[PDB]
Amino acid sequence: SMGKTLRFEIVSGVNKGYFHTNSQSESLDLVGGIWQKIAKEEFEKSNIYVSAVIKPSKTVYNQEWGCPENGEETVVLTGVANEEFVDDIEKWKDTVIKLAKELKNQMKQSTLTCEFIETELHYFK
Amino acid sequence: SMGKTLRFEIVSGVNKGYFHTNSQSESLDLVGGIWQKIAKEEFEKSNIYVSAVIKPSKTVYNQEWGCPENGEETVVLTGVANEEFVDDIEKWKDTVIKLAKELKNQMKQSTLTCEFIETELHYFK
Amino acid sequence: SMGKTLRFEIVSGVNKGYFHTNSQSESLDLVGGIWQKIAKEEFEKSNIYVSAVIKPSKTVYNQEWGCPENGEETVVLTGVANEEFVDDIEKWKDTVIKLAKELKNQMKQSTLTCEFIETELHYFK
Numbered sequence: 001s002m003g004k005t006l007r008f009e010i011v012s013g014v015n016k017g018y019f020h021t022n023s024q025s026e027s028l029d030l031v032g033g034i035w036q037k038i039a040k041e042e043f044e045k046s047n048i049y050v051s052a053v054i055k056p057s058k059t060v061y062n063q064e065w066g067c068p069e070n071g072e073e074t075v076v077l078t079g080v081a082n083e084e085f086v087d088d089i090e091k092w093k094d095t096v097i098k099l100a101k102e103l104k105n106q107m108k109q110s111t112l113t114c115e116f117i118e119t120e121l122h123y124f125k
Numbered sequence: 126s127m128g129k130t131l132r133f134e135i136v137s138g139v140n141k142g143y144f145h146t147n148s149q150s151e152s153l154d155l156v157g158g159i160w161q162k163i164a165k166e167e168f169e170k171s172n173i174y175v176s177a178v179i180k181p182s183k184t185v186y187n188q189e190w191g192c193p194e195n196g197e198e199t200v201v202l203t204g205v206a207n208e209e210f211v212d213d214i215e216k217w218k219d220t221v222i223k224l225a226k227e228l229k230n231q232m233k234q235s236t237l238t239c240e241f242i243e244t245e246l247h248y249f250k
Numbered sequence: 251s252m253g254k255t256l257r258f259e260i261v262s263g264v265n266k267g268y269f270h271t272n273s274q275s276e277s278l279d280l281v282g283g284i285w286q287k288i289a290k291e292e293f294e295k296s297n298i299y300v301s302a303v304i305k306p307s308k309t310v311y312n313q314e315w316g317c318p319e320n321g322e323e324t325v326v327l328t329g330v331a332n333e334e335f336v337d338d339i340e341k342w343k344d345t346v347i348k349l350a351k352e353l354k355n356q357m358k359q360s361t362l363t364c365e366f367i368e369t370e371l372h373y374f375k
Contacts, residue, residue: 032195
């Protein structure tokens with residue numbers, strides 16, 4: 001049940017220009033599919049499968065720097081290191097960083113953020 | 126205004142098989158209604174009412190373990206302990222855990238996660 | 251790349267009564283537009299531009315205190331202090347608090363919460 005651990009949160013654009021998607025639902029499928037693919041690959045190499053909860057969102061920033069009025073379509077990916085499956089937090093933390101950089105590449109992103117946050121996880125099973 | 130406290134985050138499936146829901150909006154109403162019900166019950170017993178902000182999402186994991194392509198419908202519930210209403214963080218923390226386990230039961234979930242995160246809350250009123 | 255910093259999270263209502271909005275998409279545009287406006291103003295005074303990732307949500311609380319069945323439309327705004335643009339975490343933290351109070355005023359909110367959370371940011375560029 002109880003355990004002090006890490007959660008991650010990744011924010012990424014959806015590059016509608018490159019992928020030609022027109023709805024948020026399409027962008028969520030795009031990013032979900034890409035994550036499913038690269039997490040699987042990395043799982044078959046390290047036996048660490050990093051799941052992700054993904055939410056659609058909009059990022060609001062300066063219109064002078066090219067943000068559309070009221071914000072730009074983005075996706076947020078979150079996940080947590082469950083010590084029932086994760087034996088080393090550092091190996092997991094390095095795997096997340098690896099997947100973050102690969103997601104940035106697959107999504108053709110100029111920038112991407114990956115945060116880690118200390119969290120106390122309760123897992124009911 | 127300022128105060129160092131706890132926030133919780135709960136991730137749960139929506140069990141479309143059990144409840145026969147076909148849209149995300151239906152799943153959000155389902156989980157919102159259940160939470161409204163059990164938080165009320167627990168409030169009438171402990172005088173602690175735990176509110177929750179709920180967001181629809183998708184959880185992406187291995188397709189070999191039964192995840193649909195691009196992810197499975199989930200809901201995220203978040204909330205924070207406001208010291209203007211919460212006199213003991215530990216009683217609140219135990220009440221959240223109680224509601225988490227009850228939500229897992231009402232949602233017929235095999236598993237469920239409940240995290241607590243240290244946060245500095247500013248409450249403007 | 252690596253850096254220990256702060257993230258913020260703001261939860262706000264959308265006051266459909268005041269603004270006469272009928273869809274979530276309308277409420278997201280409303281809040282996105284307001285944030286874009288006040289962050290720009292504050293940027294031109296302090297040279298700190300605070301971006302925000304915004305998500306629609308519902309807040310579930312007691313129906314006796316006026317919450318609709320299954321929850322009330324809300325918006326969640328999140329952001330992070332990137333030390334590549336933020337030279338003083340305290341000036342940034344004060345600017346977020348400033349924008350939070352201004353957003354509360356522009357949204358005609360009785361209450362509003364603003365949380366800060368310690369986070370380790372990895373910025374890929």
